[PDB]
Coordinates of N, CA and C and ligand atoms in Angstrom, one line a residue:
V3 N 123.3 92.7 121.1 CA 122.0 93.3 121.1 C 122.0 94.6 120.5
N4 N 121.0 94.9 119.6 CA 120.8 96.2 118.9 C 119.4 96.6 119.0
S5 N 119.1 97.8 118.5 CA 117.8 98.5 118.7 C 116.7 98.2 117.7
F6 N 116.9 97.4 116.6 CA 115.9 97.1 115.6 C 114.8 96.3 116.2
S7 N 113.5 96.6 115.8 CA 112.4 96.0 116.4 C 111.4 95.5 115.4
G8 N 110.7 94.4 115.7 CA 109.7 93.8 114.8 C 110.2 93.2 113.6
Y9 N 111.5 92.9 113.5 CA 112.0 92.2 112.3 C 111.6 90.7 112.3
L10 N 111.4 90.2 111.2 CA 111.4 88.7 111.0 C 112.8 88.3 110.6
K11 N 113.3 87.2 111.2 CA 114.7 86.7 111.0 C 114.6 85.8 109.8
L12 N 115.3 86.1 108.7 CA 115.3 85.2 107.6 C 116.4 84.1 107.6
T13 N 117.6 84.6 107.9 CA 118.8 83.7 108.0 C 119.6 84.1 109.3
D14 N 120.7 83.6 109.5 CA 121.6 83.9 110.6 C 121.8 85.4 110.6
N15 N 121.9 86.1 109.5 CA 122.3 87.5 109.4 C 121.4 88.5 108.7
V16 N 120.3 88.0 108.1 CA 119.4 88.8 107.3 C 118.0 88.8 108.0
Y17 N 117.5 90.0 108.2 CA 116.2 90.3 108.8 C 115.4 91.2 107.9
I18 N 114.0 91.1 108.0 CA 113.1 91.8 107.1 C 111.9 92.4 107.8
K19 N 111.4 93.5 107.4 CA 110.3 94.2 108.0 C 109.5 95.0 106.9
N20 N 108.3 95.2 107.2 CA 107.5 96.1 106.4 C 107.6 97.4 107.1
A21 N 108.4 98.3 106.5 CA 108.6 99.6 107.2 C 109.1 100.6 106.1
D22 N 108.8 101.9 106.4 CA 109.4 103.0 105.7 C 110.8 103.3 106.2
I23 N 111.8 103.1 105.3 CA 113.2 103.2 105.7 C 113.4 104.6 106.3
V24 N 112.8 105.6 105.9 CA 113.0 107.0 106.4 C 112.5 107.0 107.9
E25 N 111.4 106.5 108.2 CA 110.8 106.4 109.5 C 111.6 105.5 110.4
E26 N 112.0 104.4 109.9 CA 112.9 103.4 110.6 C 114.2 104.1 110.9
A27 N 114.7 104.8 109.9 CA 116.0 105.4 110.2 C 115.8 106.5 111.2
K28 N 114.8 107.4 111.2 CA 114.7 108.4 112.2 C 114.5 107.9 113.6
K29 N 114.0 106.7 113.7 CA 113.7 106.1 115.1 C 114.9 105.4 115.5
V30 N 115.4 104.6 114.7 CA 116.5 103.8 115.1 C 117.9 104.6 115.2
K31 N 118.2 105.6 114.3 CA 119.5 106.3 114.2 C 120.5 105.2 114.0
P32 N 120.4 104.3 113.0 CA 121.4 103.3 112.9 C 122.7 103.9 112.5
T33 N 123.8 103.1 112.7 CA 125.1 103.5 112.3 C 125.2 103.7 110.8
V34 N 124.5 102.9 110.0 CA 124.6 102.9 108.6 C 123.1 102.7 108.0
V35 N 122.7 103.7 107.2 CA 121.5 103.5 106.4 C 122.0 103.4 104.9
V36 N 121.5 102.5 104.2 CA 121.9 102.3 102.8 C 120.9 103.1 101.9
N37 N 121.4 103.9 101.0 CA 120.6 104.5 99.9 C 120.8 103.7 98.6
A38 N 119.6 103.6 98.0 CA 119.5 103.1 96.6 C 119.9 104.2 95.6
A39 N 121.2 104.4 95.5 CA 121.7 105.5 94.7 C 121.9 105.2 93.2
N40 N 122.0 106.2 92.4 CA 122.5 106.1 91.0 C 123.9 106.7 91.0
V41 N 124.6 106.5 89.8 CA 126.0 106.8 89.8 C 126.3 108.3 89.9
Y42 N 125.3 109.2 89.7 CA 125.4 110.6 89.8 C 125.0 111.1 91.1
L43 N 124.6 110.3 92.0 CA 124.0 110.7 93.3 C 122.9 111.7 93.1
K44 N 122.1 111.6 92.1 CA 120.9 112.4 91.9 C 119.7 111.8 92.6
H45 N 119.4 112.3 93.7 CA 118.4 111.6 94.6 C 117.0 112.1 94.3
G46 N 116.5 111.8 93.2 CA 115.2 112.4 92.7 C 114.0 111.6 93.1
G47 N 114.1 110.3 93.3 CA 112.9 109.6 93.6 C 113.2 108.2 94.2
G48 N 112.2 107.4 94.4 CA 112.4 106.2 95.1 C 112.9 106.4 96.5
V49 N 113.6 105.4 97.0 CA 114.3 105.5 98.3 C 115.1 106.7 98.4
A50 N 115.9 107.0 97.3 CA 116.9 108.1 97.4 C 116.1 109.4 97.5
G51 N 115.1 109.6 96.8 CA 114.4 110.9 96.9 C 113.7 111.0 98.2
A52 N 113.2 109.9 98.8 CA 112.6 109.9 100.1 C 113.6 110.2 101.2
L53 N 114.8 109.5 101.1 CA 115.8 109.8 102.1 C 116.3 111.3 102.0
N54 N 116.5 111.7 100.8 CA 117.0 113.1 100.6 C 116.0 114.1 101.1
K55 N 114.7 113.9 100.8 CA 113.7 114.8 101.3 C 113.7 114.9 102.8
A56 N 113.9 113.8 103.5 CA 113.9 113.7 104.9 C 115.1 114.5 105.5
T57 N 116.1 114.7 104.8 CA 117.3 115.5 105.2 C 117.1 117.0 104.8
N58 N 116.0 117.4 104.2 CA 115.8 118.8 103.8 C 116.8 119.1 102.7
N59 N 117.1 118.2 101.8 CA 118.0 118.3 100.7 C 119.5 118.4 101.1
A60 N 119.8 118.3 102.4 CA 121.3 118.3 102.8 C 122.0 117.1 102.1
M61 N 121.4 115.9 102.0 CA 122.0 114.8 101.3 C 122.4 115.2 99.9
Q62 N 121.5 115.8 99.2 CA 121.8 116.2 97.8 C 123.0 117.2 97.7
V63 N 123.0 118.2 98.6 CA 124.0 119.2 98.6 C 125.4 118.5 98.9
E64 N 125.5 117.6 99.9 CA 126.7 116.9 100.1 C 127.1 116.1 98.9
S65 N 126.1 115.4 98.3 CA 126.4 114.5 97.2 C 126.9 115.3 96.0
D66 N 126.4 116.5 95.7 CA 126.8 117.3 94.6 C 128.3 117.6 94.8
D67 N 128.7 118.0 96.0 CA 130.1 118.3 96.3 C 131.0 117.0 96.1
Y68 N 130.5 115.8 96.5 CA 131.2 114.6 96.3 C 131.4 114.3 94.8
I69 N 130.4 114.5 94.0 CA 130.6 114.2 92.6 C 131.5 115.2 91.9
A70 N 131.3 116.5 92.3 CA 132.2 117.5 91.7 C 133.7 117.2 92.0
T71 N 134.0 116.6 93.1 CA 135.4 116.2 93.4 C 135.8 114.9 92.8
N72 N 134.9 113.9 92.8 CA 135.3 112.5 92.6 C 134.8 112.0 91.3
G73 N 133.8 112.6 90.6 CA 133.2 112.0 89.5 C 132.2 110.9 89.9
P74 N 131.5 110.4 88.9 CA 130.4 109.4 89.2 C 131.0 108.1 89.9
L75 N 130.1 107.5 90.6 CA 130.3 106.1 91.0 C 130.2 105.1 89.9
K76 N 130.7 103.9 90.1 CA 130.5 102.8 89.2 C 129.2 102.1 89.6
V77 N 128.5 101.5 88.5 CA 127.4 100.6 88.8 C 128.0 99.4 89.6
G78 N 127.4 99.1 90.7 CA 128.0 98.1 91.6 C 128.8 98.6 92.7
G79 N 129.1 99.9 92.6 CA 130.0 100.6 93.6 C 129.2 101.4 94.7
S80 N 130.0 102.0 95.5 CA 129.4 102.7 96.7 C 130.3 103.8 97.2
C81 N 129.8 104.7 98.0 CA 130.5 105.6 98.8 C 129.9 105.9 100.1
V82 N 130.7 106.2 101.1 CA 130.2 106.5 102.5 C 130.1 108.0 102.6
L83 N 128.9 108.6 102.9 CA 128.7 110.0 103.2 C 128.0 110.1 104.5
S84 N 127.7 111.3 104.9 CA 127.0 111.6 106.1 C 125.6 110.9 106.1
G85 N 125.1 110.5 107.3 CA 123.7 110.1 107.5 C 122.8 111.2 107.9
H86 N 123.3 112.4 108.0 CA 122.5 113.6 108.3 C 121.7 113.3 109.6
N87 N 120.4 113.6 109.6 CA 119.5 113.4 110.7 C 118.9 112.0 110.7
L88 N 119.4 111.1 109.8 CA 118.8 109.8 109.7 C 119.6 108.7 110.3
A89 N 120.9 108.8 110.3 CA 121.9 107.8 110.7 C 123.2 108.4 110.9
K90 N 124.2 107.7 111.5 CA 125.5 108.2 111.5 C 126.1 108.4 110.1
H91 N 126.0 107.4 109.3 CA 126.5 107.3 107.9 C 125.4 106.9 107.0
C92 N 125.5 107.3 105.7 CA 124.8 106.8 104.6 C 125.7 106.1 103.6
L93 N 125.5 104.8 103.4 CA 126.2 104.1 102.4 C 125.4 104.2 101.1
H94 N 125.9 105.0 100.1 CA 125.2 105.1 98.8 C 125.7 104.0 98.0
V95 N 124.8 103.0 97.6 CA 125.1 101.9 96.8 C 124.4 101.9 95.5
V96 N 125.1 101.7 94.4 CA 124.5 101.7 93.1 C 124.2 100.3 92.6
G97 N 123.0 99.8 92.7 CA 122.6 98.6 92.0 C 122.3 98.9 90.5
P98 N 122.4 97.8 89.7 CA 122.0 98.0 88.3 C 120.6 98.4 88.1
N99 N 120.3 99.4 87.2 CA 119.0 99.8 86.9 C 118.6 99.1 85.6
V100 N 117.7 98.1 85.7 CA 117.1 97.4 84.6 C 116.4 98.3 83.6
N101 N 115.8 99.4 84.1 CA 115.2 100.4 83.2 C 116.2 101.2 82.4
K102 N 117.5 101.1 82.7 CA 118.6 101.6 81.9 C 119.4 100.5 81.1
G103 N 119.1 99.3 81.2 CA 119.8 98.2 80.5 C 121.1 97.7 81.2
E104 N 121.3 97.9 82.5 CA 122.5 97.5 83.2 C 122.5 96.0 83.6
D105 N 123.6 95.4 83.6 CA 123.7 94.0 83.8 C 123.3 93.6 85.2
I106 N 122.4 92.7 85.4 CA 121.9 92.3 86.6 C 122.9 91.6 87.5
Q107 N 123.9 91.0 86.8 CA 124.9 90.3 87.6 C 125.7 91.3 88.5
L108 N 125.6 92.6 88.1 CA 126.2 93.6 89.0 C 125.5 93.8 90.3
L109 N 124.4 93.2 90.5 CA 123.7 93.2 91.7 C 124.5 92.6 92.9
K110 N 125.1 91.5 92.6 CA 126.0 90.8 93.6 C 127.1 91.8 94.0
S111 N 127.8 92.4 93.1 CA 128.8 93.4 93.4 C 128.3 94.5 94.3
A112 N 127.1 95.0 94.0 CA 126.5 96.0 94.8 C 126.3 95.6 96.2
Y113 N 125.7 94.4 96.4 CA 125.5 93.9 97.8 C 126.9 93.6 98.5
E114 N 127.9 93.3 97.8 CA 129.2 93.1 98.5 C 129.7 94.3 99.3
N115 N 129.2 95.5 98.9 CA 129.6 96.7 99.6 C 129.1 96.6 101.1
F116 N 128.0 95.9 101.3 CA 127.4 95.8 102.6 C 128.4 95.1 103.6
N117 N 129.3 94.3 103.1 CA 130.1 93.5 103.9 C 131.2 94.3 104.6
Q118 N 131.4 95.6 104.2 CA 132.3 96.5 104.9 C 131.7 97.1 106.1
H119 N 130.5 96.8 106.5 CA 129.8 97.4 107.6 C 129.1 96.3 108.5
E120 N 129.4 96.3 109.8 CA 128.9 95.2 110.6 C 127.4 95.1 110.7
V121 N 126.7 96.3 110.7 CA 125.2 96.3 110.8 C 124.7 97.4 109.9
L122 N 123.6 97.1 109.1 CA 123.1 98.1 108.2 C 121.6 98.0 108.2
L123 N 120.9 99.2 108.0 CA 119.5 99.3 107.6 C 119.5 99.5 106.1
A124 N 118.8 98.7 105.4 CA 118.9 98.8 103.9 C 117.6 98.5 103.2
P125 N 117.4 99.1 102.0 CA 116.4 98.6 101.1 C 116.9 97.5 100.3
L126 N 116.0 96.8 99.6 CA 116.4 95.8 98.6 C 117.0 96.5 97.4
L127 N 118.3 96.3 97.1 CA 118.9 96.9 96.0 C 118.3 96.5 94.7
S128 N 118.2 97.5 93.8 CA 117.7 97.4 92.4 C 116.2 97.1 92.4
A129 N 115.5 97.1 93.5 CA 114.0 97.0 93.6 C 113.4 98.3 93.2
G130 N 112.1 98.4 93.4 CA 111.3 99.6 93.1 C 111.6 100.1 91.7
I131 N 111.9 101.5 91.6 CA 112.0 102.1 90.3 C 113.3 101.6 89.6
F132 N 114.2 100.9 90.2 CA 115.3 100.3 89.5 C 115.0 99.1 88.7
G133 N 113.8 98.5 88.9 CA 113.2 97.6 87.9 C 113.6 96.2 88.0
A134 N 114.4 95.8 89.0 CA 114.7 94.4 89.2 C 113.5 93.7 90.0
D135 N 113.5 92.3 89.9 CA 112.6 91.5 90.7 C 113.0 91.5 92.2
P136 N 112.2 92.1 93.1 CA 112.6 92.1 94.5 C 112.9 90.7 95.1
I137 N 112.2 89.7 94.7 CA 112.5 88.4 95.2 C 113.9 87.9 94.8
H138 N 114.3 88.2 93.6 CA 115.7 87.9 93.2 C 116.7 88.7 94.0
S139 N 116.4 90.0 94.1 CA 117.2 90.8 94.9 C 117.4 90.3 96.3
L140 N 116.3 89.8 96.9 CA 116.4 89.2 98.3 C 117.3 88.0 98.3
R141 N 117.2 87.1 97.2 CA 118.1 86.0 97.1 C 119.5 86.3 97.1
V142 N 119.9 87.3 96.2 CA 121.3 87.8 96.1 C 121.7 88.3 97.4
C143 N 120.9 89.1 98.1 CA 121.3 89.7 99.4 C 121.6 88.6 100.3
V144 N 120.8 87.6 100.5 CA 121.0 86.5 101.4 C 122.3 85.7 101.1
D145 N 122.5 85.5 99.8 CA 123.7 84.7 99.3 C 125.0 85.6 99.2
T146 N 124.9 86.9 99.5 CA 126.1 87.7 99.3 C 126.5 88.4 100.6
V147 N 125.6 89.0 101.4 CA 125.9 89.7 102.5 C 126.1 88.8 103.7
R148 N 127.2 89.0 104.4 CA 127.5 88.2 105.6 C 127.4 89.0 106.9
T149 N 127.4 90.3 106.8 CA 127.2 91.2 108.0 C 125.7 91.3 108.2
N150 N 125.3 91.9 109.3 CA 123.9 91.9 109.8 C 123.1 93.0 109.1
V151 N 122.1 92.6 108.3 CA 121.4 93.5 107.5 C 119.9 93.4 107.8
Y152 N 119.3 94.6 108.1 CA 117.9 94.8 108.4 C 117.2 95.5 107.2
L153 N 116.4 94.7 106.5 CA 115.8 95.1 105.2 C 114.5 95.7 105.5
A154 N 114.3 97.0 105.1 CA 113.0 97.7 105.2 C 112.4 97.6 103.9
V155 N 111.1 97.1 103.8 CA 110.4 97.0 102.6 C 109.1 97.8 102.8
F156 N 109.0 98.9 102.0 CA 107.9 99.9 102.1 C 106.6 99.3 101.9
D157 N 106.4 98.4 100.8 CA 105.1 98.0 100.4 C 104.7 96.7 101.1
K158 N 103.6 96.8 101.9 CA 103.2 95.6 102.7 C 102.9 94.4 101.8
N159 N 102.2 94.6 100.7 CA 101.9 93.5 99.8 C 103.2 92.9 99.3
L160 N 104.2 93.6 99.0 CA 105.5 93.1 98.6 C 106.2 92.3 99.7
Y161 N 106.1 92.9 100.9 CA 106.7 92.3 102.1 C 106.2 90.9 102.3
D162 N 104.8 90.7 102.0 CA 104.2 89.4 102.3 C 104.6 88.4 101.2
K163 N 104.8 88.9 100.1 CA 105.2 88.0 99.0 C 106.6 87.5 99.1
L164 N 107.5 88.4 99.5 CA 108.9 88.0 99.7 C 109.0 87.0 100.8
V165 N 108.3 87.2 101.9 CA 108.4 86.2 103.0 C 107.8 84.9 102.6
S166 N 106.6 84.9 102.0 CA 105.9 83.6 101.7 C 106.7 82.8 100.7
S167 N 107.5 83.4 99.8 CA 108.2 82.7 98.8 C 109.6 82.4 99.1
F168 N 110.1 82.8 100.4 CA 111.5 82.7 100.7 C 111.9 81.3 100.9
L169 N 113.0 80.9 100.3 CA 113.5 79.5 100.5 C 114.6 79.5 101.5
Ligands
WWH1 C1 111.2 96.8 96.6 C2 112.0 98.0 96.7 C3 111.3 99.2 97.2 C4 112.3 100.4 97.3 N1 111.7 101.6 97.7 C5 111.7 101.9 99.1 N2 112.0 101.0 100.0 C6 112.0 101.2 101.3 N3 111.6 102.3 101.8 C7 111.2 103.3 101.0 N4 110.7 104.6 101.2 C8 110.4 105.1 100.0 N5 110.8 104.3 99.1 C9 111.2 103.1 99.6 N6 110.2 99.7 96.3 C10 108.8 99.5 96.7 O1 108.5 99.0 97.7 C11 107.8 100.1 95.7 C12 106.6 99.1 95.4 C13 107.0 97.8 94.7 C14 105.7 97.2 94.2 C15 105.8 96.8 92.7 C16 107.1 96.0 92.4 C17 108.3 96.9 92.8 C18 107.9 98.1 93.5

């Protein structure tokens, strides 16, 4: 038993809700919140900008030190950093950005990072400003992640569409 509420159960291990991940994170305090990161951990907009804003820019400060030490992530890769006031940990995961020409097949590799964590609150990778089809992203999620994932979908219209078209 865990503390997530009002989720719809999609599969054995995937759940979905219409929620603001920032507000869900601050209420739940999950062990892991996933950020829709880029390779530079520049959290300027989308989910990343919203999560970073909710940390009062502490996420960005920590991220800049991470990059200065380690260099950029790989597309499809991840790193674990602090969750600040939102979660114990933040798993920064880089899905391919279609608006940058990156290969969509890397979306499966991105979701594989979730399997290193027993339970996660997450957005749909490569959705939103990353330019992928969120329905596709949901299919890859369901077919790749084996751990328990609670998907927060900000847009109510999108949430209805994803549920109604789910196979
Ligand atoms: C689907 C991925 C999410 C990722 N962004 C966030 N996801 C969760 N919580 C957040 N808080 C702040 N941002 C987010 N994007 C959207 O919902 C934008 C609207 C749709 C509608 C048109 C087609 C794609 C974009």
